């Protein structure tokens, strides 16, 4: 499972608009636990693609 820092870097490196990136990062801080972080990463992939 990717760490919180890796997931943040992925958001930052994506081509999404800045406000979209900022809101995703805000949501990330509310995620708690390895399981939810993994689910976060999965949904994030669908948005990035």
């Amino acid at each position: 499972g990717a760490s919180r820092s890796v997931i943040r870097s992925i958001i930052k490196s994506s081509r999404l608009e800045e406000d979209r990136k900022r809101y995703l990062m805000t949501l990330l801080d509310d995620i708690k636990g390895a399981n939810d972080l993994a689910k976060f990463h999965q949904m994030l992939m669908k948005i990035i693609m």
């Binding site: 990330l28 509310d30 708690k32 636990g33 939810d36 976060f40 949904m43 669908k46």
Partner: peptide
Amino acid sequence: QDSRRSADALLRLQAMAGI
């Protein structure tokens, strides 16, 4: 409360992904 907040964040994320 921490888990519920996390669950809600995932729901908000899901809505952005249009899932």
